[PDB]
Amino acid sequence: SQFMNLEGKVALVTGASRGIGKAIAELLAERGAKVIGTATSESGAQAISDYLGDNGKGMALNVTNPESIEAVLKAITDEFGGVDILVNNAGITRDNLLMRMKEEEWSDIMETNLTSIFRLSKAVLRGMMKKRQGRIINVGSVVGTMGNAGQANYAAAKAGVIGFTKSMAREVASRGVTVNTVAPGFIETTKALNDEQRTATLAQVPAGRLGDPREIASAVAFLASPEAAYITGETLHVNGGMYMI
Amino acid sequence: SQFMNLEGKVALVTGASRGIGKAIAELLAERGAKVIGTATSESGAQAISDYLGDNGKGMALNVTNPESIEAVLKAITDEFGGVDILVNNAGITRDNLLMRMKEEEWSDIMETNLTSIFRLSKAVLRGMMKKRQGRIINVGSVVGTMGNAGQANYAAAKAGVIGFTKSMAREVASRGVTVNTVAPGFIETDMNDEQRTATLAQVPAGRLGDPREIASAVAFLASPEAAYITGETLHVNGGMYMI
Amino acid sequence: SQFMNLEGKVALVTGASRGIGKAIAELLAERGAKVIGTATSESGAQAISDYLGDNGKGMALNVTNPESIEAVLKAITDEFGGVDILVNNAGITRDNLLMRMKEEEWSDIMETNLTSIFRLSKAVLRGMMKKRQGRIINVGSVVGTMGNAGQANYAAAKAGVIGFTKSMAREVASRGVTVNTVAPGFIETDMNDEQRTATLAQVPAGRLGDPREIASAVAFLASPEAAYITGETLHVNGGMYMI
Amino acid sequence: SQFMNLEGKVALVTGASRGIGKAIAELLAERGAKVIGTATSESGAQAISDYLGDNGKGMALNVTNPESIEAVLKAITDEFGGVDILVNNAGITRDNLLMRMKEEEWSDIMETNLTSIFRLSKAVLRGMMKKRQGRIINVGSVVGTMGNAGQANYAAAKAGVIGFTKSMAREVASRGVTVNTVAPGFIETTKALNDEQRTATLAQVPAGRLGDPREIASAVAFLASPEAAYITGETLHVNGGMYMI
Ligand SMILES: NC(=O)C1=CN([C@@H]2O[C@H](COP(=O)(O)OP(=O)(O)OC[C@H]3O[C@@H](n4cnc5c(N)ncnc54)[C@H](OP(=O)(O)O)[C@@H]3O)[C@@H](O)[C@H]2O)C=CC1
Numbered sequence: 012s013q014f015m016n017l018e019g020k021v022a023l024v025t026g027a028s029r030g031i032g033k034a035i036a037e038l039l040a041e042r043g044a045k046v047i048g049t050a051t052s053e054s055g056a057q058a059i060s061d062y063l064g065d066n067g068k069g070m071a072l073n074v075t076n077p078e079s080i081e082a083v084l085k086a087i088t089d090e091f092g093g094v095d096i097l098v099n100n101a102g103i104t105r106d107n108l109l110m111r112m113k114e115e116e117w118s119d120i121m122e123t124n125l126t127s128i129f130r131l132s133k134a135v136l137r138g139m140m141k142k143r144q145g146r147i148i149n150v151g152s153v154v155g156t157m158g159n160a161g162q163a164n165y166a167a168a169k170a171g172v173i174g175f176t177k178s179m180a181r182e183v184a185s186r187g188v189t190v191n192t193v194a195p196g197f198i199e200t201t202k203a204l205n206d207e208q209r210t211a212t213l214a215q216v217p218a219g220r221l222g223d224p225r226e227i228a229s230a231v232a233f234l235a236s237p238e239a240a241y242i243t244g245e246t247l248h249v250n251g252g253m254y255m256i
Numbered sequence: 257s258q259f260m261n262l263e264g265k266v267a268l269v270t271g272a273s274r275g276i277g278k279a280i281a282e283l284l285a286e287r288g289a290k291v292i293g294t295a296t297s298e299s300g301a302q303a304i305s306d307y308l309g310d311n312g313k314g315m316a317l318n319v320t321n322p323e324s325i326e327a328v329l330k331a332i333t334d335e336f337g338g339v340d341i342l343v344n345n346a347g348i349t350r351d352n353l354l355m356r357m358k359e360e361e362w363s364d365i366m367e368t369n370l371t372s373i374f375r376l377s378k379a380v381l382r383g384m385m386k387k388r389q390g391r392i393i394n395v396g397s398v399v400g401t402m403g404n405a406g407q408a409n410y411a412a413a414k415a416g417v418i419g420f421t422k423s424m425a426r427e428v429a430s431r432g433v434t435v436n437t438v439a440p441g442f443i444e445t446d447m448n449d450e451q452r453t454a455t456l457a458q459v460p461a462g463r464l465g466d467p468r469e470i471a472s473a474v475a476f477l478a479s480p481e482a483a484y485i486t487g488e489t490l491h492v493n494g495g496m497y498m499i
Numbered sequence: 500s501q502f503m504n505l506e507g508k509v510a511l512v513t514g515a516s517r518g519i520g521k522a523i524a525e526l527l528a529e530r531g532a533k534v535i536g537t538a539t540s541e542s543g544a545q546a547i548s549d550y551l552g553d554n555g556k557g558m559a560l561n562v563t564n565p566e567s568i569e570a571v572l573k574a575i576t577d578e579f580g581g582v583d584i585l586v587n588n589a590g591i592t593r594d595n596l597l598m599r600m601k602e603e604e605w606s607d608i609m610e611t612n613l614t615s616i617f618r619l620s621k622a623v624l625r626g627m628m629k630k631r632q633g634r635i636i637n638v639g640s641v642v643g644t645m646g647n648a649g650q651a652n653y654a655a656a657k658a659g660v661i662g663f664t665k666s667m668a669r670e671v672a673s674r675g676v677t678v679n680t681v682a683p684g685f686i687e688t689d690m691n692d693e694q695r696t697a698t699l700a701q702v703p704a705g706r707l708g709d710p711r712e713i714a715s716a717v718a719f720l721a722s723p724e725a726a727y728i729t730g731e732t733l734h735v736n737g738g739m740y741m742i
Numbered sequence: 743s744q745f746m747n748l749e750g751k752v753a754l755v756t757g758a759s760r761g762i763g764k765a766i767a768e769l770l771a772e773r774g775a776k777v778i779g780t781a782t783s784e785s786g787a788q789a790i791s792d793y794l795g796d797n798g799k800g801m802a803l804n805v806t807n808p809e810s811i812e813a814v815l816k817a818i819t820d821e822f823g824g825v826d827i828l829v830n831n832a833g834i835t836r837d838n839l840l841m842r843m844k845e846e847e848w849s850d851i852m853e854t855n856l857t858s859i860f861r862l863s864k865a866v867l868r869g870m871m872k873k874r875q876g877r878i879i880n881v882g883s884v885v886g887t888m889g890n891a892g893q894a895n896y897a898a899a900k901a902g903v904i905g906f907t908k909s910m911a912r913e914v915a916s917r918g919v920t921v922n923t924v925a926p927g928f929i930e931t932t933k934a935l936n937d938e939q940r941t942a943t944l945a946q947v948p949a950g951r952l953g954d955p956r957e958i959a960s961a962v963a964f965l966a967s968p969e970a971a972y973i974t975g976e977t978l979h980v981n982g983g984m985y986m987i
Pocket residue numbers: 025026027028029030031032049050051052055072073074075099100101102103123150151152153194195196197198199200201
C-alpha cells in the first residue's frame with residue numbers, strides 16, 4: 012500500500028549486523044527503503060549484504076572515526092544519492108559502579124554512544140535540509156530516562172542523546188526534517204544473562220517478558236514514515252511498562 | 257501485508273463523525289479492523305455508517321451516559337463480539353480563565369474528557385483481559401503535558417487521562433492488554449486568524465498537524481507490532497513540546 | 500533570619516489535623532506565617548487550634564462543599580485578610596482494581612482530590628493577583644506521575660492536579676503568583692506488613708519519608724526565595740521515581 | 743535555627759567566582775557550611791577567599807584536569823576533612839548551529855560540562871558513602887530538558903548530567919547520599935545580550951523576567967539541607983515557567 016511506505020528513501024542503519032539494528036534494517040527494506048547497514052568489519056558488512064540482497068547493502072563503519080564516516084557517506088551518496096533516513100543504532104556498554112569505573116570506560120561510552128550521533132547527524136543533515144525532507148532516529152535506552160546503577164556512563168550518553176535530539180529537532184523542524192529517539196527497554200538479544208538476573212529484570216517489567224527486536228524495528232519504521240512527519244523532538248518508549256513518562 | 261494488520265479486530269472509536277475521530281476510524285478500517293464509530297446524534301451515526309460501508313457502522317453514543325454506553329457495547333458485542341481496540345477520542349473544550357470559569361465548564365470537561373475514559377475502559381476491559389489481548393488508546397492533548405492559559409479544566413482532564421492510563425497499564429500488562437495515550441498538538445480541525453499565527457508561532461514545524469497524522473499514530477499503537485508499548489504518551493505536535 | 504521567612508503571610512492548609520498537613524501547618528507557622536489549618540469536624544478544628552496556639556487557628560472545612568469553602572474564606576478574610584499561601588493537602592484514597600471500582604469511588608476521588616483544587620484555587624486567586632503576590636502549592640503523589648495498579652482513580656486525580664497547576668502557572672505568572680505541586684512518595688502516615696516491605700522494595704532510600712520532609716519542600720516553595728519556580732512538580736520520594 | 747542548617751558540613755562549589763556559583767557559595771556559608779569555592783586562576787581563588795572570609799576559602803581548579811582535581815580535594819580533605827556537599831556548577835557554552843559546530847566546540851562542552859561531573863563525583867563519593875551522608879547537586883539548565891537551537895552540544899551535556907544523576911542516585915541512595923540537579927532558566931548574569939535577544943527570550947518566560955542568581959542559590963541550599971534527604975534523582979526547575987515537566 013501507500014501506508015508506511017519508504018519506497019524512494021535511502022536509509023543508513025549503523026550497527027546492523029545483529030539484534031535490533033538488523034531487525035531495523037530488515038523492516039525498513041520490507042517497507043521499501045534502500046538500506047545501507049553497517050558493521051565494524053568487512054566480514055560483518057558482507058553478512059549484512061547477504062541478508063539485504065537487492066534491497067541494499069553492507070559497509071564497514073567505525074562511528075568514532077571521522078574518516079570512516081566520510082568514506083561511507085560518499086560511497087552511499089555516489090551510488091544511492093543522499094541519505095533520507097539516519098538510524099543511529101551503533102552503541103556499547105562499559106558497565107561498572109562509579110568507584111570502579113575507568114576513565115576509558117567513561118570516555119569510550121561518550122565517544123561511541125553520544126559523540127557519534129553528533130558526527131553522523133551533522134554529516135547527513137545538509138542534504139536532508141536542502142531536500143526539505145529527512146528523518147534522524149536515535150536508538151536510546153530506558154536507562155537514559157530511568158537511570159540504572161552500574162550504568163552511569165551509559166545512562167549519561169543515552170540521556171545526552173535526547174538533549175541533542177530535542178535541540179536538533181528545534182533547529183531543523185521548519186525545513187521538514189524530524190529528529191527523534193526510540194528508547195527500548197529490555198529486549199531479547201540479554202540472552203546468556205544469569206537465570207537470576209533475568210527474573211530480577213523481568214520482575215520490573217509489567218508485560219512480564221522481554222521485548223522482541225522486531226518491536227523496536229516497528230517503532231523505528233513508524234517514525235521513519237511520511238505519516239510520522241508531525242512527530243519531532245520525541246522519545247518513544249518501548250519497554251513493556253518498565254518505565255512510564 | 258501482515259504488517260500493521262488489524263483484520264479480525266473489533267475497534268470502537270468514540271466521536272468518529274468528524275476530524276481526528278473520523279480519520280482514526282477510516283485508517284483502522286483501511287488496516288482491516290471492523291470499526292464502530294460513534295456520534296452524539298443518529299444523523300451523525302448514519303454519516304459514520306455511510307463512510308465505513310462494509311467495514312463497520314455508526315452508533316449514537318453520549319460518553320457521559322452509563323445507559324448509552326451499555327446499550328452501545330451490548331449492540332456491538334451481540335453483532336461483532338467483544339471490543340479489541342478502544343479509542344477514546346470523544347472530547348470537548350470549555351475555555352475560560354479561572355476567574356471566569358463556571359462550575360459547569362469545569363464539570364462538563366471532567367465528565368466528557370476524563371470520567372468517560374474510566375467508564376468506557378472499565379466496560380471493555382474484562383473481555384480484553386479474558387482474551388489476553390487488547391488495546392486501549394486515549395486521545396489526549398499536548399495541553400495535558402504543557403498546560404495552557406485559559407484551559408485549566410481541559411489540561412486537568414487531559415493530564416488525568418495519563419495518570420489513569422499509566423495505572424491501567426500496570427494493572428493489565430501481564431494479561432496482554434496495552435493502554436496508551438496519543439497526545440496531538442494543534443491539528444487542523446473544527447477548532448481567530450490572530451490566534452492561529454500566535455499558536456503556529458510556537459510550532460517549530462511551522463504548520464498545524466493533519467488529522468491523518470493523529471490517525472497514523474493511533475493505528476500504530478493499535479497494531480500487534482506495538483505490543484511492548486504501554487503506559488506511554490506519544491506526542492504528535494510538530495515540536496511544540498518535547499518531553 | 501530573613502531567609503525563608505513567611506512573617507506577614509496568611510497560609511491556608513487544608514486537611515491539617517494529622518500527618519502531612521499537620522507537619523506543613525507547623526512548619527509554615529515556625530517560619531512566621533499566620534496559619535489556618537482545616538479538618539472535616541469541629542473537634543478536628545479545635546485540635547488544630549490547640550497546636551497552632553497564637554500562630555493561627557483551626558476551622559472546619561469540607562473541600563467538596565462550595566458553601567463550606569465560602570464560609571471558611573470569608574471568616575479568614577474578615578479576621579486575617581486575604582490568603583497569601585494556599586496549600587491544597589486534603590485528599591483521600593478509594594483503592595480498587597478497575598473491574599471492582601465503584602462509580603462513587605471514582606467520583607469521590609475526582610471531587611476530593613481534583614475538583615477541590617479548582618474550587619479553592621479559584622476562591623483565593625483574585626486577591627493574590629491583585630496583590631501581585633501569591634503561592635498555590637498542591638500536594639500530589641508519586642502515583643500521579645508513576646501510575647499504580649489498584650489506584651487508577653487516585654492516579655488520574657493526582658495527574659490532573661499537575662495539568663491544572665501548569666495551566667494556572669501560565670495564567671498567573673505575570674502577576675507574581677506561583678503555582679506548583681509537591682509530589683510525595685511513600686510517607687509514614689496513617690495509610691499490611693507485607694505490602695510495606697513490597698513498597699519499600701521499590702524505594703532506593705530504603706525507608707518511608709517523614710511528613711516533615713514533605714513540609715520542608717512546601718515551606719520552600721512557599722518562600723519569597725522560590726519566586727522563580729512555577730508550573731513545577733517537586734518529587735520527594737526517596738528515588739522511587741525519577742523524572 | 744536548626745531549619746536548613748549546614749553547620750558542620752563541608753561544601754565544594756566549582757566555578758564560584760561569579761554569578762550563580764558565587765551566590766551558591768555565599769548562601770551555603772550563610773546557612774553554616776564551611777565552603778570551598780573554585781576558580782580557574784589563583785587571582786580568582788583569592789577573590790573567592792575575600793568574599794567567604796572565615797566561612798571558607800578559594801582554590802584554583804580546572805575541572806577537566808585529573809591532577810588539579812586530586813590536588814584540590816587532598817587540600818580540602820587535609821584542612822577541613824571530607825566533602826559533604828558537592829556543587830558541580832562550573833560549565834561553559836560553545837554555541838553554534840550543527841553545520842557550523844566544530845569538533846572542539848563539541849568535545850570541550852562534553853569535557854567541561856559532563857565528564858567533569860563523573861570525575862568530581864567519583865572523587866568525593868567514597869567518603870560520603872562511608873559517612874552514610876552526602877549531597878551531590880549539579881547545576882544543569884532548562885536547555886537540557888527543553889532543547890535549544892544553536893546549543894545541541896550544551897543540551898546534550900546538560901541532558902547527560904541528568905542521566906548520570908539518576909544512575910548515581912540509584913547507586914548510592916541506600917547509603918544516605920542524594921544526587922540531584924538544579925536546572926536554571928534564564929538568569930541575570932545574559933547581560934549585554936542584545937536588547938532584541940532578551941525580549942525574545944523573555945517573551946518565552948511567563949514570569950516576564952530573568953531569574954536572580956540568588957534564586958538558583960536558594961534551590962541548591964534547599965537540596966543541600968538535611969530536610970532534603972528524601973529527594974534524590976530529581977531535576978528541580980527554576981525557570982519562571984519557561985518549561986513545565
Ligand atoms: N539490548 C538491549 O536490551 C538494549 C539495547 N539498547 C541499545 O540498542 C542498540 C543496539 O542494541 P543491541 O541490538 O543490543 O546491540 P548489539 O551489540 O547486538 O549490536 C551492536 C552493533 O553495533 C556495532 N558497533 C559497536 N561499536 C561500534 C563502533 N565503534 N562503530 C560502529 N559500529 C559499532 C556492532 O558492529 P559489529 O557487528 O562489527 O560488532 C554491531 O553491529 C544500542 O544503541 C544499544 O545501546 C537499548 C536498550 C536496551
